[PDB]
C-alpha cells in the first residue's frame, strides 16, 4: 500500500522523470527523464542485457521505427490493433471503454449500499474484461448505464480505435506510414539473414531494444501509460515439434504465483506453484515458455520487484492478441492494481507466414531426408518503462522519523550509484583519503560520487537515500588524525553503520553490492559504530 502522491513528488523533485513540455501545459502520456532517471534506466537495460542477451547468446538488431503501411497491414495491426473508445455526446472527450467500465464497477462495489449478491456479480465481470468484445461491452455500458466520469454526460457506444500513429514518408501521400507499436516485426522481416547466422539450425533468438509508439487513448497512469516508451523484445524461434528448453531445469524449483486462464474463468484465485510442477500438470504448455517465465521472474526480482506482488496471468480465449494463440503476462501489483509489465506470448507462427505470403518470399528452416518447417516463436516482451515504475512503488519507503524523509531500497545493480563517499572537510587533509578511496572503488568497479552538499552528515545522507544510493562511507577527522585510519560504512536501508580501515572498505562494499556478503556479515566481522 504505497502512497503514490508522496512518491511521485520525490521522483519529480530529484528529477527521475517529469512532465514533457511542462512549460507548455504538458501532454498526457509524455514524460522526460532526468539524470537520476537515466542512470537507473540505463542500469535496468544493462542488467537485462546480461540476463537475456548475454546469458542466452541472443542476436541483436536495431530496426527503424517508421514503417510503411503495407508492413503493418500484413501483420494485422492495421486491423486488430486497437482499443474500444467511448466519448460523451456533449463534447469530444474520449475514454478507453475497457477501463472506464472497470472504474465504474469499482465505484459501485465500494458503495456500502451495494449488496453482497451484486458486489460478487461485478467481480465476475471485471475478472473477464479483456474478453468482452465489441457488442458485449456495449451491453455492460447500458446495463450499468455508464456515463462520463466528469460532469457525467451521456456516453456514446464503444468503438474500435487504432492505437498506431499515422504519418507520411517522403513528400506527397503515395507512401503512408506508421510508428511501430512493437519491434517484433523488424526481426521477422530479417528472418533469413538472422537464420543464416545460426548456420540454419533451430532454435535461435533475436532481440531488439528500441522505442515503440502507442497513440494511447486517455493516459492517466503516469509512467504506466505512455504514448512512447523503450521496450526490449526477444523472438525465440523454435521448431513446433521441439518446444522443449534444455535449461528449464535451472528454474524448475521456482515457486511463483500462477493465475491460469481456468482459475479466471472458474472464479477461483491464483496458485503459488513450482515452475516444474506447473509444466507437468499441463498448466504451462511447454518448457520453452516455462524457462522464460522463470528467467523473467528472476530478472524482475533481481531488479527490485517484490515476489509477494508479482504473478503470471494467462490470457483468456478471446483476450488473445491477434498474433497469438497463448500468452502469459508478468503482472505486478501496484497502486493501479495488477498491471502487465512483461508479456510472454506464443505466436505459434502467425508472423513469418503472413509476411511470407504477402511478399511471396519463403521464410522457413529445415531439419533432418530433410524437412522444412515454419518456426514457432515465443516472444518475451519487456516494457522497461513499467518495470522501472514497479520498482519505484516496491522499494519506496518513508523513514520512521518525523521529518518524513523517504528513500528507495534499490538493489545494488540498479541504484544510480552503489556507494556515496562523503567527507566532513574537503580541505587538503581529507583529499589524500577521499582520492585513494575513490580510485580504490573504481578499481573494484563500484560506481560512486563524492558528496559536497551542505548540512550535517545526517542530512547529507538523507539526500543520498532519497535517490536510493546503496551504501555510504563517511570520512571524518578520526579517519585522518587517528591511526589506523578508519572510516564509517553506512547501510542505506537500516542506516546502521560500521567502522573499518579506509583501505578495506573498498573490497567490502564490492562484496556487499555484488551480493557476496550480507550486511549482517559486515556487522559480524567489524566493530559497530553508533
Touching a copy of itself, residues 203-222 (CB under 8 A): 211, 213, 215-218
104: partner contacted, choices a copy of itself, ligand ATP, none (Cβ within 5-8 A by kind):
none
Q: Which C-beta is closer to a copy of itself: that of 69 or that of 340?
A: 69
55 is in an annotated binding site: no
- Locate 98 and state its grid cell: 475497457
Q: Which C-beta is closer to ligand ATP: that of 71 or that of 387?
A: 387
Whole-angstrom distance, CA of residue 397 vs CA of residue 508: 26
Among 8, 228, 329, 331, interactor with a copy of itself by CB under 8 A: 228
383: partner contacted, choices a copy of itself, ligand ATP, none (Cβ within 5-8 A by kind):
ligand ATP
Among 231, 275, 278, 505, interactor with ligand ATP by CB under 6 A: 231
Question: If binding is defined by CB under 8 A, does position 35 make contact with a copy of itself?
Answer: yes
Whole-angstrom distance, CA of residue 471 vs CA of residue 8: 23
217 is in an annotated binding site: no
Question: If binding is defined by CB under 6 A, does position 385 make contact with ligand ATP?
Answer: yes
Q: ∠ CA(274), CA(275), CA(280), 5° rounding? A: 95
Residues just before a chain gap in the chain (C–N exceeding 2.5 Å) are 368
- Evaluate the CA torsion angle 116, 120, 125, 126 in order and state its sign: positive
String of contacts with a copy of itself for each residue 163-202, x by CB under 8 A:
--xxxxxxxx-xx---x------x--xx--x---x-----
Question: If binding is defined by CB under 6 A, does position 342 make contact with ligand ATP?
Answer: yes
**Under DSSP, is residue 102 helix (H, G, I), strand (E, B) or coil?**
helix
On whether the CB atoms of residues 528 and 497 are closer than 8 A, the answer is yes
Question: If binding is defined by CB under 6 A, does position 165 make contact with ligand ATP?
Answer: no
Among 67, 314, 376, 381, interactor with ligand ATP by CB under 6 A: 381
Q: Which C-beta is closer to a copy of itself: that of 77 or that of 313?
A: 77
Phi-psi region of 42 (alpha: psi -120 to 50; beta: other; left: phi over 0): alpha
DSSP for 471-495 reads EEEEE-HHHHSSSS-EEEEEETTT-
- Strands 486-491 and 497-501, bridge-based pairing: antiparallel
With CA atoms as reference, report the closest residue to 29 among 212, 178, 166: 212
Closest-approach residue to ligand ATP (CB) = 383
Question: If binding is defined by CB under 8 A, does position 71 make contact with a copy of itself?
Answer: yes
- Strands 371-373 and 327-334, bridge-based pairing: unpaired
**Under DSSP, is residue 50 helix (H, G, I), strand (E, B) or coil?**
helix
Q: Which C-beta is closer to ligand ATP: that of 328 or that of 396?
A: 328
Touching a copy of itself, residues 93-112 (CB under 8 A): 94
Question: If binding is defined by CB under 6 A, does position 383 make contact with ligand ATP?
Answer: yes
| Half-sphere CA count of 331, side-chain side, radius 13 A | 21
Whole-angstrom distance, CA of residue 468 vs CA of residue 388: 13
Reported in sequence order, the residue ranges of 156-277 that DSSP labels E, i.e. its strands, are 159-162, 166-168, 176-179, 204-213, 228-238, 255-259, 271-274
Whole-angstrom distance, CA of residue 475 vs CA of residue 425: 9
String of contacts with ligand ATP for each residue 209-228, x by CB under 6 A:
-----x-x--------xx--
Q: Which C-beta is closer to a copy of itself: that of 28 or that of 47?
A: 28
Touching a copy of itself, residues 49-68 (CB under 8 A): 59-68
Touching a copy of itself, residues 365-424 (CB under 8 A): none
Residue 81 Cβ vs ligand ATP, minimum distance, rounded to whole Å: 8
Q: Where are the alpha helices (DSSP H) in 229-271?
A: 261-265
String of contacts with ligand ATP for each residue 284-323, x by CB under 6 A:
----------------------------------------
123 is in an annotated binding site: no
379 is in an annotated binding site: yes
Task: Give the list of residues 6+ apart from residue 404 with CB closer than 8 angstroms, or none.
Answer: 398
- Locate 516 and state its grid cell: 557476496
**Under DSSP, is residue 296 helix (H, G, I), strand (E, B) or coil?**
helix
On whether the CB atoms of residues 43 and 411 are closer than 8 A, the answer is no
Tell me whether residue 58 is exposed, middle or buried, using C-beta atoms within 10 angstroms of its C-beta: 0 to 12, 13 to 18, 19 or more.
Answer: middle
Question: If binding is defined by CB under 8 A, does position 479 make contact with a copy of itself?
Answer: no
Residue 212 Cβ vs ligand ATP, minimum distance, rounded to whole Å: 8
With contacts defined by CB under 6 A, name the span among 69-77, 258-266, 294-302, 378-386 that binds ligand ATP: 378-386
225 is in an annotated binding site: yes
393: partner contacted, choices a copy of itself, ligand ATP, none (Cβ within 5-8 A by kind):
none
Question: If binding is defined by CB under 8 A, does position 475 make contact with a copy of itself?
Answer: no
Among 15, 161, 165, 229, interactor with ligand ATP by CB under 6 A: 229
DSSP 420: E
On whether the CB atoms of residues 355 and 188 are closer than 8 A, the answer is yes
226 is in an annotated binding site: yes
Among 340, 351, 451, 465, interactor with ligand ATP by CB under 6 A: 340
Question: If binding is defined by CB under 8 A, does position 361 make contact with a copy of itself?
Answer: yes
Q: How far is CA 64 from the centre of its chain?
A: 22
On whether the CB atoms of residues 28 and 224 are closer than 8 A, the answer is no
Residue 428 Cβ vs ligand ATP, minimum distance, rounded to whole Å: 44
Which residues here bind a copy of itself, judged by CB under 8 A?
Answer: 15, 18, 20-24, 27-35, 37-39, 41, 59-68, 70-71, 85, 92, 94, 161, 165-172, 174-175, 179, 186, 189-190, 193, 197, 211, 213, 215-218, 227-228, 355, 359, 361
**Binding-site residues from annotation for ATP:** 214-216, 225-226, 340-341, 386
**Binding-site residues from annotation for glycine:** 182, 233, 379-381
**Binding-site residues from annotation:** 182, 214-216, 225-226, 233, 340-341, 379-381, 386
Which residues here bind ligand ATP, judged by CB under 6 A?
Answer: 214, 216, 225-226, 229, 231, 340-343, 381, 383, 385-386
Amino acid at each position: 500500500i504505497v502512497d503514490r502522491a508522496k512518491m511521485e513528488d520525490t521522483l519529480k523533485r530529484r528529477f527521475f522523470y517529469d512532465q514533457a513540455f511542462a512549460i507548455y501545459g504538458g501532454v498526457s502520456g509524455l514524460y522526460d527523464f532526468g539524470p537520476v532517471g537515466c542512470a537507473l534506466k540505463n542500469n535496468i537495460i544493462q542488467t537485462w542485457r546480461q540476463h537475456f542477451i548475454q546469458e542466452e547468446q541472443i542476436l541483436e538488431i536495431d530496426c527503424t521505427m517508421l514503417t510503411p503501411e503495407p508492413v503493418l497491414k500484413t501483420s494485422g495491426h492495421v486491423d486488430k490493433f486497437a482499443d474500444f473508445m467511448v466519448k460523451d455526446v456533449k463534447n469530444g472527450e474520449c475514454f478507453r471503454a475497457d477501463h472506464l467500465l472497470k472504474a465504474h464497477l469499482q465505484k459501485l462495489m465500494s458503495d456500502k449500499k451495494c449488496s453482497v449478491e451484486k458486489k460478487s456479480e461485478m467481480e465476475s465481470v471485471l475478472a473477464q474484461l479483456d474478453n468482452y468484445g465489441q457488442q458485449e461491452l456495449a451491453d455492460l455500458f447500458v446495463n450499468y448505464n455508464v456515463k462520463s466520469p466528469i460532469t457525467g454526460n451521456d456516453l456514446s457506444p464503444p468503438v474500435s480505435f487504432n492505437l498506431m500513429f499515422k504519418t507520411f514518408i517522403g513528400p506527397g501521400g503515395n507512401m503512408p506510414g506508421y510508428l511501430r507499436p512493437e519491434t517484433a516485426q523488424g526481426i521477422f522481416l530479417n528472418f533469413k539473414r538472422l537464420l543464416e547466422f545460426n548456420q540454419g539450425k533451430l532454435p535461435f533468438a533475436a532481440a531488439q531494444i528500441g522505442n515503440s509508439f502507442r497513440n494511447e487513448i486517455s493516459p492517466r497512469s503516469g509512467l504506466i501509460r505512455v504514448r512512447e516508451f523503450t521496450m526490449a523484445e526477444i523472438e525465440h524461434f523454435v521448431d513446433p515439434s521441439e518446444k522443449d528448453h534444455p535449461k528449464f531445469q535451472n528454474v524448475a524449483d521456482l515457486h511463483l504465483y500462477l493465475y491460469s486462464a481456468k482459475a479466471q474463468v472458474s472464479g477461483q484465485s491464483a496458485r503459488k506453484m513450482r515452475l516444474g510442477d506447473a509444466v507437468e500438470q499441463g498448466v504451462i504448455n511447454n518448457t520453452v515458455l516455462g524457462y522464460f517465465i522463470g528467467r523473467i521472474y528472476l530478472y524482475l526480482t533481481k531488479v527490485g520487484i517484490s515476489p509477494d506482488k508479482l504473478r503470471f496471468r494467462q490470457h483468456m480465449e478471446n483476450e488473445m492478441a491477434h498474433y497469438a494463440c497463448d500468452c502469459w503476462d508478468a503482472e505486478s501489483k501496484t497502486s493501479y492494481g495488477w498491471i502487465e509489465i512483461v508479456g510472454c506470448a506464443d505466436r505459434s507462427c502467425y508472423d513469418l507466414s503472413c509476411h511470407a505470403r504477402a511478399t511471396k518470399v519463403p521464410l522457413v528452416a529445415e531439419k533432418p531426408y530433410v524437412e522444412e518447417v515454419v518456426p514457432n516463436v515465443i516472444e518475451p516482451s519487456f516494457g522497461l518503462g513499467r518495470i522501472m515504475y514497479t520498482v519505484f512503488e516496491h522499494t519506496f519507503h518513508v523513514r520512521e522519523g518525523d521529518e518524513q524523509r523517504t528513500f528507495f531500497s534499490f538493489p545494488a545493480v540498479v541504484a544510480p550509484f552503489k556507494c556515496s563517499v562523503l567527507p566532513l572537510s574537503q580541505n587538503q587533509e581529507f583529499m589524500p583519503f577521499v582520492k585513494e578511496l575513490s580510485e580504490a572503488l573504481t578499481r573494484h568497479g563500484v560506481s560512486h560520487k563524492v558528496d559536497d552538499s551542505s548540512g550535517s552528515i545526517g542530512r547529507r545522507y538523507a539526500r543520498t537515500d532519497e535517490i536510493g544510493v546503496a551504501f555510504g562511507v563517511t570520512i571524518d577527522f578520526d579517519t585522518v588524525n587517528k591511526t589506523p585510519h578508519t572510516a564509517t560504512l553506512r547501510d542505506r536501508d537500516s542506516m546502521r553503520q560500521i567502522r573499518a580501515e579506509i583501505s578495506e572498505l573498498p573490497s567490502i562494499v564490492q562484496d556487499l553490492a555484488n551480493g557476496n556478503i550480507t550486511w549482517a556479515d559486515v556487522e559480524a566481522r567489524y566493530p559497530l559504530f553508533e
